[PDB]
Amino acid sequence: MTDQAFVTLTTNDAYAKGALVLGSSLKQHRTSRRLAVLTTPQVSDTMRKALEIVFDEVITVDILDSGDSAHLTLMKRPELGVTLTKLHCWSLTQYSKCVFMDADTLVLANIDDLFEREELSAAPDPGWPDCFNSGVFVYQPSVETYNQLLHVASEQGSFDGGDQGLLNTFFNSWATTDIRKHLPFIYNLSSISIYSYLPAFKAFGANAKVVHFLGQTKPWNYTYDTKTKSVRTHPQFLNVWWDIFTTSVVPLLQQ
Amino acid sequence: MTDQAFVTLTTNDAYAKGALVLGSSLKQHRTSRRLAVLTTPQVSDTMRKALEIVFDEVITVDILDSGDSAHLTLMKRPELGVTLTKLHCWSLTQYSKCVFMDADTLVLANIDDLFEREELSAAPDPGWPDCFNSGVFVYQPSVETYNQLLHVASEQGSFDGGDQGLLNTFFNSWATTDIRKHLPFIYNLSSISIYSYLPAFKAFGANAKVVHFLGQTKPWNYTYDTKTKSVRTHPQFLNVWWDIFTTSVVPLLQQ
Numbered sequence: 193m194t195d196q197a198f199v200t201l202t203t204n205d206a207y208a209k210g211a212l213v214l215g216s217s218l219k220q221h222r223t224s225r226r227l228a229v230l231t232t233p234q235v236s237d238t239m240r241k242a243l244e245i246v247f248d249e250v251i252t253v254d255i256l257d258s259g260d261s262a263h264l265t266l267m268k269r270p271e272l273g274v275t276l277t278k279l280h281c282w283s284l285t286q287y288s289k290c291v292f293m294d295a296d297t298l299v300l301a302n303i304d305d306l307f308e309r310e311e312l313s314a315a316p317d318p319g320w321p322d323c324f325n326s327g328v329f330v331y332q333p334s335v336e337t338y339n340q341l342l343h344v345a346s347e348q349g350s351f352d353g354g355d356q357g358l359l360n361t362f363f364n365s366w367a368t369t370d371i372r373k374h375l376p377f378i379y380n381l382s383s384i385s386i387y388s389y390l391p392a393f394k395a396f397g398a399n400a401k402v403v404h405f406l407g408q409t410k411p412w413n414y415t416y417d418t419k420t421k422s423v424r425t426h427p428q429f430l431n432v433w434w435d436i437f438t439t440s441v442v443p444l445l446q447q
Numbered sequence: 448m449t450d451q452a453f454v455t456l457t458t459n460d461a462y463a464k465g466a467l468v469l470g471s472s473l474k475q476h477r478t479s480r481r482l483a484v485l486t487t488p489q490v491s492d493t494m495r496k497a498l499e500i501v502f503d504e505v506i507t508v509d510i511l512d513s514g515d516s517a518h519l520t521l522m523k524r525p526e527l528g529v530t531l532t533k534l535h536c537w538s539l540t541q542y543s544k545c546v547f548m549d550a551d552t553l554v555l556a557n558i559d560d561l562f563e564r565e566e567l568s569a570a571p572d573p574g575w576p577d578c579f580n581s582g583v584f585v586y587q588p589s590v591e592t593y594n595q596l597l598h599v600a601s602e603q604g605s606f607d608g609g610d611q612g613l614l615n616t617f618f619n620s621w622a623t624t625d626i627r628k629h630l631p632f633i634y635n636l637s638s639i640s641i642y643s644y645l646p647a648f649k650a651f652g653a654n655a656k657v658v659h660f661l662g663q664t665k666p667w668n669y670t671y672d673t674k675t676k677s678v679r680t681h682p683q684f685l686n687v688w689w690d691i692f693t694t695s696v697v698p699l700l701q702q
C-alpha cells in the first residue's frame with residue numbers, strides 16, 4: 193500500500209527515540225503500509241538521518257515560521273504548540289487514510305487491520321471513557337478538515353490544553369455513535385491501566401497490540417542494563433521498548 | 448409504570464444507608480418507575496423498616512441458607528458472596544425490565560430514559576474501558592439468565608473476584624457491539640474520575656446524572672458537620688449525599 197500510512201510525531205530528540213522504536217516495531221511486525229513522521233527543525237541531524245532510514249517519509253513542520261498556516265494560532269495560544277504541529281498530520285494528502293500514533297507507543301503485533309476503520313476511529317481514554325485517547329487514531333488527510341480543526345483551536349482552544357480536548361470536541365459523536373469507531377483498548381493500552389485495573393490486564397493484557405507509555409515518565413527516562421537486559425507489571429513492556437532501542441536503534445544512530 | 452423498576456442491594460446496615468439515600472434521590476427526581484431493594488437477614492429491623500418506607504418492594508435473600516439456589520456456589524466460591532446475592536436481581540421476574548444500581552450511587556436527575564435501553568446496557572469502566580462498570584446497568588429479569596450466570600460463577604468464577612468480572616465475561620459483546628448498550632459515562636460517574644481526568648470533569652461534569660462513590664471510602668465513612676453542612680472536587684457530591692441523608696433519611700430512621 194502506498195496511499196495509506198502510519199504517521200507519528202516528534203518535535204525533539206527525546207521523542208525521536210520513541211518514533212524510531214515505534215517505526216522499528218511496525219517494520220518488525222511486517223506492515224504493508226507506509227511509515228511517515230512529522231518532525232520540526234529542532235530534531236538534530238543525527239536523529240533526522242536515523243528517521244530518514246526507519247521512515248519512508250520525513251516531513252518537516254515549523255510553526256515558529258510566519259509562513260506556516262498555524263503560526264498565528266500559536267502566537268495566540270502558546271500552550272497548543274505541540275497540538276498545532278500534530279494537526280499537520282491532516283495535511284498529508286498524499287495519503288488517503290492514516291493511523292496517527294504517539295511517539296511514545298510501541299507495536300506488539302501487526303495492526304494493519306486498523307485501515308479498515310473510518311475517520312475518526314480511536315480507543316476509549318481511561319479516566320473519562322466517553323472521550324477517546326488521541327494517542328492512536330484512524331483519520332483521513334484533508335486540507336478542509338485541517339482548516340476546520342485549526343479554526344476551532346484558534347476560536348476556542350482545547351478543554352484540556354492539549355490536542356485530545358480539541359479532537360474530542362471536533363469529533364464529538366464518538367461516544368454515542370458507531371461502535372466501529374471505538375477501537376479496542378488493546379490498540380492503545382495505556383501502560384497505567386496495568387495498575388488501575390490489574391485484574392482486567394491479567395485477563396486481557398496478553399492480547400495487547402499497542403502499548404502506550406502515557407504519563408510523565410517515558411521509556412527513555414529509565415536506565416537500561418544491557419547485561420541483565422532490564423530497566424532499573426510494567427517492566428515487561430519497557431524491556432521490549434529497550435530491547436528494540438538497544439538492538440536496532442542505537443546501532444542505527446551510529447550509522 | 449409497575450413492571451419496571453430500579454433495583455439496588457444491601458447486605459448490611461452500612462450499605463443500607465446508601466440504599467436509603469439512593470432511593471430518596473430517585474423519588475426526589477420524580478421517577479415514574481418502581482423502587483426495589485435486595486436485602487439479607489443481616490440488615491437490622493431499624494434499617495429494614497426505613498427501607499420498607501423508601502422502597503416499593505423489599506426482597507430478602509439468604510444465600511447462607513441451604514434452600515437458596517446459590518448456596519452451593521457460595522460454599523465453593525466464598526469470595527463471591529456479595530456477587531451471588533446480587534445475581535438474584537435477575538430473579539425479580541415481577542418486573543419486565545430493571546436498572547440495577549449500586550447502594551453507593553446517587554441520582555442527580557431523573558434517569559427514567561434508561562428504560563429505553565436493552566439488556567445488557569452499562570457505562571464504560573474507567574481503568575479498563577473495554578469492560579463496563581457493573582454499578583449501574585439495564586437488564587431483563589429472567590430465571591434462565593439467572594441460572595446461566597450462576598452456572599458460569601460456579602464453573603469458572605470471576606476474573607476480578609467480583610460481579611463485574613463475571614458480568615463482563617457473560618455479556619462479552621459489550622465492547623464491540625451496539626453503541627446503544629454503552630450508557631453515557633454521566634449515568635455512572637465514578638467519583639474517582641474527578642481526579643484522573645479533571646479537565647474532562649470540568650468540561651462535562653456539570654451534566655452528571657448519577658454519581659458513583661466507587662472505592663474504599665464511602666459517604667458514610669466521613670464525618671458531616673450539620674452546622675457548616677459539609678463533610679470533613681469531590682465534596683460537592685459528598686455534601687449532596689449527606690444533605691439527603693441528614694434531611695430525609697435520619698429523620699426516617701427515627702420514625
Ligand SMILES: O=c1ccn([C@@H]2O[C@H](COP(=O)(O)OP(=O)(O)O[C@H]3O[C@H](CO)[C@@H](O)[C@H](O)[C@H]3O)[C@@H](O)[C@H]2O)c(=O)[nH]1
Nearest residue numbers: 201202203204207274294295296325326327356405406407
Ligand atoms: O515535547 C514534546 C511533547 C510531545 N510530543 C509528541 O506529542 C505526543 C503526545 O505527548 P505525550 O508526551 O506522549 O503525552 P501523553 O503522556 O501520552 O499525554 C498526553 O496526551 C494523551 C494523548 O495524546 C492524552 O490522553 C493525555 O491526557 C495527555 O496528558 C508524543 O507522543 C509525541 O509524538 C513531541 O513531539 N514533543
Ligand SMILES: O=c1ccn([C@@H]2O[C@H](COP(=O)(O)OP(=O)(O)O[C@H]3O[C@H](CO)[C@@H](O)[C@H](O)[C@H]3O)[C@@H](O)[C@H]2O)c(=O)[nH]1
Nearest residue numbers: 456457458459462529549550551580581582611660661662
Ligand atoms: O458488604 C457489602 C459490600 C457490597 N455491597 C453491595 O455491592 C455493591 C458493590 O460494592 P461497592 O462497595 O459499592 O464496590 P465498588 O467500590 O463500587 O467496587 C467494586 O464494584 C464496582 C462495580 O460493582 C467495580 O467497578 C469495582 O472494580 C469493584 O472493586 C454495593 O454498592 C452494595 O450494593 C453490600 O451490600 N455489602
Ligand SMILES: [Mn+2]
Nearest residue numbers: 294296327406
Ligand atoms: Mn503519548
Ligand SMILES: [Mn+2]
Nearest residue numbers: 549551582661
Ligand atoms: Mn459501588
